[PDB]
């Protein structure tokens, strides 16, 4: 059984250097033709290939990132390290390392190369956020209005993830939509949480927001304005 | 470099259907192509290697064929765990490219979004910023287009949006879009509009308000 696992800092600041380690078990980087590669996935985006290293020590890099990447192996520790320099916000992504089989051998003779055509086992992935922000609590603002009515709370400018939002201390669940946060160009996150109700219920509505990182709890009652 | 284009980018289906996803390469990649299935929150999982070989432990309903520039993955009888995003990967040329992915989600009947526009709170305005949010609630299919207009000027580069994951009961999606402006710019205009295009809407729907109107 082959397993891989990524480790490194979850948070990194722009211009800094990011070092990611892939520790694995079940194979050796001294085994014939084996490879270990790195692939990343920005939130909501497609997979992007970064680099790979083989047991005979040949290395290859994405041409778009070549100047900022270094991949290396430590055979005796069963680890592969990928160093990315000068990171910027667009480098925020989940980073995965993965195993690549070498050709099948028969009495130590390569006879099948078809198994090298895939990365067959992947690590769970490590989430890395690139932002110059310091920890900071959200500002919470009201969002106020088939014949459904909508209202919500805009949880703005906080760092880092995550934040939790519930409605009426947990009693309101139907019609609730808490969207995934977006990382603003400022380096702070922002999210909305809304709830749809029969245009008659306008019943009281309060969003309970909690950002553990900054010890910031806020309950904000939201109503249909006009005094 | 080499381009790998997946089709369709998104696909709706129901348990028991037969689906086929295709991947086309800009130059021939021989048989060096792999297919993966990735479920939300998890790493991609290898299904098919070397264009058509079934990876060990992978269920037989998955099948891959093709070589050169055109490949296809077919799942013969879709199971609930197959609602996910699929990717193809080329390993003939460096860099080892991935396709754009194809999202497979629960089919349901077309449903237009209920649209709502929210002006910025007076509380936010006092801090100097103005957020205008637009909500597209419970729609299907997933693709929707939101266009912000301020006093009829088309907005660009000053909004961000996020979409919920498919609802497990509804099978619909919801989308939130935030237009952000300084309090000053905000004050220099009156009509804030959120224009929405979607398959379930005969023509675009616009929700708006005039700033300061009381």
């Amino acid at each position: 059984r082959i397993t891989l696992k990524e480790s490194g800092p979850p948070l990194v600041k722009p211009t800094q250097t990011l070092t990611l380690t892939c520790s694995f078990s079940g194979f050796s980087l001294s085994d014939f033709g084996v490879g270990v590669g790195w692939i990343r996935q920005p939130p909501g985006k497609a997979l992007e290939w970064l680099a790979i290293i083989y047991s005979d020590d040949d290395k290859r890099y994405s041409p778009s990132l070549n100047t900022r990447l270094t991949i290396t192996k430590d055979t005796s520790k069963n680890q592969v390290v990928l160093v990315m320099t000068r990171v910027s916000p667009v480098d925020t992504a989940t980073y995965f390392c993965a195993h690549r089989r070498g050709p099948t051998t028969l009495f130590g003779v390569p006879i099948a190369r078809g198994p090298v055509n895939a990365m067959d086992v992947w690590g769970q992935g490590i989430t890395v956020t690139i932002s110059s922000t310091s920890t900071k609590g959200p500002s919470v603002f009201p969002l106020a209005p088939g014949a459904a009515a909508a209202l919500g709370c805009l949880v703005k400018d906080y760092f880092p993830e995550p934040v939790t939002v519930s409605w009426n201390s947990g009693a309101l669940t139907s019609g609730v939509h808490t969207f995934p946060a977006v990382l603003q160009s400022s380096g702070l996150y922002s999210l909305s949480s809304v709830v749809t109700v029969p245009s008659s219920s306008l019943q009281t509505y309060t969003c309970n927001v909690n950002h553990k990182p900054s010890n910031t709890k806020v309950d904000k009652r939201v109503e249909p304005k006009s005094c | 470099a080499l381009q790998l284009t997946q089709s369709p980018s998104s696909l709706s289906a129901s348990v028991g259907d037969r689906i086929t996803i295709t991947c086309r390469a800009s130059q021939g990649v021989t048989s060096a192509l792999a297919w993966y299935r990735q479920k939300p929150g998890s790493p991609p999982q290898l299904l098919i290697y070397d264009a058509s070989s079934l990876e060990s432990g992978v269920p037989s309903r998955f099948s891959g064929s093709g070589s050169g520039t055109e490949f296809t993955l077919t799942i013969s009888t879709l199971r609930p765990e197959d609602f996910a995003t699929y990717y193809c990967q080329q390993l003939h040329f460096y860099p080892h490219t991935f396709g754009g992915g194809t999202r497979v989600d629960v089919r349901r009947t077309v449903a237009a979004p209920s649209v709502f526009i929210f002006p910025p709170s007076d509380e936010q305005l006092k801090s100097g910023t103005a957020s205008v949010v637009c909500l597209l609630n419970n729609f299907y299919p997933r693709e929707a287009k939101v266009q912000w207009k301020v006093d009829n000027a088309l907005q660009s580069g000053n909004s961000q949006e996020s979409v919920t994951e498919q609802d497990s009961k509804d099978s619909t999606y919801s989308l939130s879009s935030t237009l952000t402006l300084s309090k000053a710019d905000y004050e220099k205009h009156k009509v804030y509009e959120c224009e929405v295009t979607h398959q379930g809407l005969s023509s675009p729907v616009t929700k708006s308000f005039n700033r300061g109107e009381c």
Partner: peptide
């Protein structure tokens, strides 16, 4: 380039 195992 050509992948390590190509021909």
């Amino acid at each position: 380039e050509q992948d390590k195992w190509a021909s």
